[PDB]
Every structure is written in structure tokens, then in C-alpha cells.
Amino acid sequence: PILTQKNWDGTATYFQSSDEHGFSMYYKPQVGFVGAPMPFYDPVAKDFKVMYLQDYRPNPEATYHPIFGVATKDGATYESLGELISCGGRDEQDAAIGTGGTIYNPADKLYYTFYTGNKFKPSSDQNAQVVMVATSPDFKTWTKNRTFYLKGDTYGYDKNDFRDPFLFQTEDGVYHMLIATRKNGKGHIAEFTSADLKEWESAGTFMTMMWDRFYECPDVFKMGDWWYLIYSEQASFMRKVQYFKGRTLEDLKATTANDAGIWPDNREGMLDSRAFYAGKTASDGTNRYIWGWCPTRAGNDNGNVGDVEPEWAGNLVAQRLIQHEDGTLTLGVPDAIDRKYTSAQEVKVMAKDGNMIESGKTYTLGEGASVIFNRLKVHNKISFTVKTASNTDRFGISFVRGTDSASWYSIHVNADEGKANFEKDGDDAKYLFDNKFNIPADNEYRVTIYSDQSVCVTYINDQLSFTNRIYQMQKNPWSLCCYKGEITVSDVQVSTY
Template sequence: MHTPPPVFFRPEAGWVGDVIPYAEDGRFHLFYLLDRRAENPAGMPWHRVTTDDLVTFIDAGLALPTGTSPDSHDHNCYTGSVVRDDAGVHHLFYTAQNPVIRGADGQPLQRVAHATSTNGMATWTKHPEHTVGAPAGYESADWRDPFVFRHPDGRWHLLLAARHTGGAERRRGTVARLVSDDLVTWAIADPIWDPRRYVTQECPEVFEWNGWWYLVYSEFSDRFVTRYRMARSPEGPWLAPAQDTLDGRAWYAAKSAARNGRRFFFGWIATREGHRDDGAWLWAGTLSILEATQQPDGTLTMAPAPELLASFTQDHAAQLGLTKGPLTALDGYACVVSENELPQQFHARVVVDIEEGTREFGLLLRCSADGDTGYVLRLEPHAGRMVLDRWPRRSTGPAQWQISGDVPQILELERPAHLAPGRHVLDAVVDGDLAVLTLDGVVTLSTPLYDHSCGRLGLFVSDGRLEVVEVNLTQRPA
């Protein structure tokens, strides 16, 4: 039996780390850090995958190799960016690091390195003489993730995840800036954003969209998450939207590229140690793409691209056997579960109409026939959030009371959500151990799913009433 193509890209040789997207002539070139997770890694290179349709991915393999000797300054080639100058030459800026090359503080140096391509990014020529380290006032071990863009002043600006040498240990992070006329000689300028809030702001990027400027970054101080700020100028002041996260804990280091007036974010869904839901989060995972929609007030909402959803063309709703109609539990809990199990890869789309005062409702994914075990995408109007829960939760002993009922969901996996009475649409794109869950096309939560590998689809309501209006299940053709 033929199997459908995978929904999410992951290379055969390892895992996708930070993605460096670059769009040209309608094609997305997705450079990424290849994490081999080897016991004795031979450095971290850049690899590249391309896509024209956001559905089909062509793995182009090695793009930027690591340094050729043990003492190369770029034993590890970490995150950066790609731009093309007015002469058509492509410039690649990346973080060069070698664990054995250390600064005055004893920590491995991080420096900005430069490479160019004159053959359409097929190969790159490194220019070690252009390497730039942290100047006085900045920690030399945090000088990474260079992002280069053309500023309205006509010059090239280069942003960095950096840290001041002075100040509170956890709050020295800044988005440092260099400026240049020729992409070769750089001068230090004032930081573009200096919040004194985080350890550092990783993978910063700036772009303009319909009169708004956006600063996107990832942080691991308050939470592991990708956030954004808004301004009317690239010089700020930068404003925090009410909901400033793009996704949850499992989708990290997202950066964007635009095509035909649309903007797409490319991040990775993290893996967990031991492939267990309770396993520690690991760096790197599987590529996942979300499209941003700009709202009238300039804020951004996130959802899978329509092209991805449209690739699920085979209707299997009838085979699922899930009852539509009212579901009521005014003072308790009620659920309805499909007659048959879900396939390993699917797009489920469910429309519900909730009555005012309903406390909780949501989807059951890969659940048992009675709905008592599996994953729970729980919507909580009273708390204004969407969370991922599971049952059974972790147990610390054999007694009933030793189930961890005081850990009400996988704490890192929740998103703020507006849940007014009326109709709501729930989309679940699942492929094996990965899921992207979306509410009303505006709030998305990505996650790995390990402990429950099969099961049924269900819906539930707690302390309220809803009507199941639509249930659709589609698959990709093999």
C-alpha cells in the first residue's frame, strides 16, 4: 500500500534547527541548521530545502559547510540571514563559533561571519577576513543570529542577539545593531531594541508590512516562545500587542519570508527526550510553516497556509462516523466519540456552536472508545485560553489520588484565545507524532504527540451546551 507524502519536512540525516528563509522568484529557499545529535559532532552546517507550493519540499542537502580544521573559527555555523545586493550577488551572514576558541571571560566566542555566492546560491565563498566580533560593552559569547535588511535610510542594518556586559544577569539581553554601506565594513550603532527583560532575544528579524514594522524574536527567559513587537518605524517605539506570541512552547525560532503580499513563518516543532510526552524538550525537530494574517489594527494571527490544508483532498468523514447535533452537560461532562479510529495522517475540521456560559469544550484526539484516554484540545471561555491536555496524566503511585490532577495540562502548551458564544472552527492537522491545532484560523498551537499513537476523534462539553455543526475528515492522496 502506498503512503501519502509527509506533511512536515525533516531530513533523513538529522533534525531541523533554526530556519533561515529566503524568498526569490517565487521560490522559498529554506536554509536550516542540521542537528545530527551525534555523540562527537563534526560541527553544525547549514543545509537547504526548497519549496514552491508550501506542500512539496526538495532537499538540496549541504549549503554552507563547517570549517575544515579543528581550530576553524566556524566549526559551528549557527543562525544568520541571506540577502542579495544591487549587483545580484547573494550575501550570507552567519554565526561562527568554535567551542575551543574562547574569549577573555572563558566562554566560546561568537562572531558574525560572511560568505558570498555568484552562482545563484549553489555554492558559497567564505570571507574570514570580514568576521566581526562583539565590541566593548557587549559579551563576546553572545553575538549571534545576524539578520541583515535594507533600512529606509538606504544603508544595510545588521541585527544581533546580544548581551550587555553590565546589568542584571538575566536581563542584559539586547537586539544590537551594526550598519554598513557595502555589506563588508560594519560600524556599531545603537541597539534597535533594548528591553532589559530577557537573557537574550534569539533570531531577531525586522520587516515592514503595510505601514507597520515588526520585530520578531525568540526568547527562553520568561517562556520558550517566539514573540513579536510592532511600530510605525524601524526605530520604534516598539509596542507589545495584547497577544504577542506566534505559537506555543513547541514551535521555536521562527523567522519569516514574504511572497505576493503574503508572509509565512518557518519554525521547528521540537522533539522530546525518549519520544515521550513527559520527556524533556530537545533543541531542533521538524519544519513547520504558518502563515501570518495582518489584522486591521496591525496585529498578527497565525494559521497553517491554505495550500497545506488544500492538499488533503480525500473525504473520509463518512467512514469516521461521528454524530452531529446537540451535546449538553449543564452541570457535568459529556462527550461524543467516533465509531472508527483516526488514520495516522489527516486534517480534521470541526465546527461547533457554543451557548453562552459554557465553561469548557473541545476536541478529543486519538481517544479511547469511551473518550477517557487520549489528547484533549480544551477551550476555556472562562479563562480565555486554548490548552493541550491528556489523559491519563502522570501518576506518582498506584492510588487514585496519586494521579497528577494538580497539573491540569501540559503547562507549556497553551495559547490565549477569544471564545465568545457562537460558532467556532477547530482544525487539526496531524501526521504521525506531530500536530498543528488551530482555532478559528487565528490561534495556533503546534505540538509533538507521542504517548497515544492511535485512537478516535471526539468532542466534549463541560458545564454547558454546544451543537456539533460540521465534522470533516480529509486525507492526502498516496
């Protein structure tokens, strides 16, 4: 049997691609999906051991969401350590395991993982969520402490809202646990102090939430000279990841103490759009990496974002935290991910629909003009530079773009609105969501898209990070378009591996 190879390079016709069950760069196990990442830095192995919850499409009704461990060292390569902590019985309090934290004790050479057990169909007198602990001697085998049950209602907190234990050790030598719970109708991040991680004292309330919202997966850390609190908003209308800044821990606590609204920056602490959730950070001592999950779309439709809140779990995504001189935080591509792309692919124009002109590597586009490039591959890195006429232009990058493509999915960087918008173009012209960022004063944009199969992350001049789930984007042409202003694109480079 002689195999036939189609002319992939030379055609711009839309092609029905498919996603493999496994992912390499943005990790996804061959079985199940990643949810709620729990990063951790191993002081012994000097690597990153990120755990998560193994979600499935047909989740069992009672017991589900086990914990699976993933070892990495750079954020690009990932190996799987298998199931670490298994879900309990139907009647056990830990039938479903929620997000947790991990901390190493040199005192007894033990890894302690504090997770949240969810009671299946809890009764009136039964706490819905209880914090539990599992100990490991070598991070491989885990034994759950059956004598530890940190009930939320013991300290006057809500029974049904007691989640996300985050553990951190300060310089004074005492470990602090933050729990995102509810008190008398108000969202409170409560602090528990310990000296041996076996007995805890509730040291009041660490912080209060902003405008009766809920914070998911709190993460307090220190980056040089500021204290940062990364959290995920549980509100259906927001469903995003924000952060708070503070020179000291006291200043961070005083931030939003009572409807203060001390936003860290002018974009209300935005980091990424709707396609990034449960962002939790870990540092190896030289760099800080945040892990989250890009959600999947029901029916494999990029425009089917879904009502209220999107689908749970998805692909593990790792980004690098960048701290500016003013204390603001921005997300950047990991160095290993950037350097993994080695081979370079020649790029050439496919379609000439607009009034654009070509002068070599430079393409000048007016309003209503667009240019279509050649096909992409499974893993793509598209880097280019766009100079706009002024600070009120609307250019855009469109994927799943073909000669006969009825609809394509676009990211429009609107300078007049000062943001970017992920929308669906074509016969539907549907608006999906957006993300605010800082507009450069020189009208210069350095656009770098890193795409693995169907998950793509766009970086704009180290100021905007935009995660997207775009199915069928691999092995399909991509295009640049302009709608209102005048743009000039250059240095277009496509790298694959």
C-alpha cells in the same frame, strides 16, 4: 505470500503507530532534524529557499550543526539542495554554526549568508561567538570569506553572547544587520549599517530587551502599515515566540525602550505555544510565511515535555502570518497546505460513553459527556464548528483515544480562562502547557486541525494557532469531550491525502 489487511475502519482499539524517517508536509529530511530555520525569498527563482541546521541525536562534541538548504514555493512541498555551508575544523571559530541571515546583492549578483560561528571550548581571550559571511554566485556553492570576523567585543558587547545576525535593506539603500547580544548585563539588539556588506559601522544600539531577558532570532519587517519585530524568548520559563508592533521604525524602537512593556495586544504578543520556536518570517511580495521547528520528545512520549526547556530541533513547520485591522498578528494555515487535502473520509461514532445525543451531523454534549470518532490516517485535516452555551465552557479535542486507551492527550479550550491547554488525560492527568487567545463573543469556534504523522497544528476561528507533537496520533481514533459547559458540534469533516 498473500498479504493480510486489518480492519482499520471499524475498530477503535489503540494501535502502536510509527513515524517515518522522512516528512512531506512539515518537512523533515530522512537524515537528521531541522533546527533554527532561516527563510529567504529568491528574487531570481521566485521561490522560498529556507536553510536550517542539520541536528543529529549523536552530535559530535566539537564540530556540528552544518547548514542544509531547502527550496519551496508554497510551504507545502519541499525539496532538498543538500549541504550548503559545512562546519569548520575542531580548532576553527566556525566549528559550530549558529542561526544566521541571507541577503542578495544585485550589485555583484551574489547571495551573502551571514552566520554565527561558535568556538569549541573558547579561551578567556577568544570570542565565543563570531559573525562570519559566505558568498554564493548561484546559491549552490558557497565560499566562506576568511577575512571577515565581526568580533562582538570590538564594540563593547558580550564575548559569549553575540548571535543571530539578521539582515534587511530599507528604502534609503543601506543594509542593516541586527545582532542579539548583551551589553553590561543587559540584552541589546545592536544595529550595524553598511552600503556594500563588506564594511560595517556600528550605528549604536537598535533596541533593548524587556526585563533582562534574551531574544533569539530577531526579525524586523514591514507589513502594510506597521513594523513588526518577531523574536524567540530564550528564557527557560517562557521558551515561546512573541512579537512587537509599531507604526514606524522609530515607534518600534521606542517600544520597550526601557521597561516600557508596550505589548502589541492583550495576550502579550503570543503567537504559538511551547511547541514552536525560532520563528522567522519571509515574504514573497504577496504573503508572509513564518518558519519554525516543532520539537521532538525524549522517549517518544507526548507527556515528556521536559524540564526547563524542551529538546532542540525537530520538524520544520510553516505558517502564514495574518494581519488584522488593528495591527495584531495571528498565524494561519498556508493555502497550499489547506488545498492539498482532496480526498474526504466518512466519519462515524465509535463509542457512546456520555449523555450526548445525535441528530445527524449535529451532536449535543453536556458536561462529562464525550464522543469518539473513527481512526485517522497519516495526513489528516479535521474541520468542525462548535457552538457553546456561554463564554465559560470547557470543551476539548483528544488524540490517541481508544476503547482500551489508558491515557489520551487532549487540548482543552477553556473559555472561562480564555485560553487553550495541552494536557495529558487518563491515569496521569498531567498538565503540559497552554496558549492564550481571543475568545469569540458569539460562542462560536471553527476548529481546524492539520496533522502530518505526529505533528498537528490546531486553528481556532482564525484567532488561535496551536502546534503540538503528538506521537501515535496517526491511525488512531480522536474524540470530542466536554467538562463543565454545554457544547454543540457540527460540520465534522475529515480529509486525507
